Amino acid sequence: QPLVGKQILIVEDEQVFRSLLDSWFSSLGATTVLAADGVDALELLGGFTPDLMICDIAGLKLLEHIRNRGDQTPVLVISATENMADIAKALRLGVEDVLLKPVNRLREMVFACLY
């Protein structure tokens, strides 16, 4: 129960991986909010602030819009992308890390971000 009291927003289009992340974070004690759609998640963020957001940048629009409004919400990107320029854009916007999928290292990044 290392993550009790932490709220995680998971933005993931793929139902299986969405459920996997929910199961993993929830098993650690976090309360999860999941959005299948990145545009839906942007709307959600206009009403609440999680301790960490996970998203795939294959997603940068969501990130650029929250960073331009002044939001300091921690973001971890999990993507299979091999596009260095895209990773670079995410890194410039401010992300905790960019994890390759299909995923481990996730535990490391999450804990090394939350506290």
Swiss-Prot record:
Effect of L60A: Lack of phosphorylation
Modified residues (4-aspartylphosphate): D56
Response regulatory domain residues: 7-113
Effect of P102S: Resistant to IraP but not to IraD. Increases stabilization by IraM. Decreases phosphorylation
Induction: Expression is induced during stationary phase by RpoS.
Function text: Regulates the turnover of the sigma S factor (RpoS) by promoting its proteolysis in exponentially growing cells. Acts by binding and delivering RpoS to the ClpXP protease. RssB is not co-degraded with RpoS, but is released from the complex and can initiate a new cycle of RpoS recognition and degradation. In stationary phase, could also act as an anti-sigma factor and reduce the ability of RpoS to activate gene expression. Is also involved in the regulation of the mRNA polyadenylation pathway during stationary phase, probably by maintaining the association of PcnB with the degradosome.
Subunit structure: Binds to RpoS with a stoichiometry of 1:1. Interacts with the anti-adapter proteins IraP, IraD and IraM.
UniProt name for this protein: Regulator of RpoS
Full-protein residues shown: 3 to 125 of 337
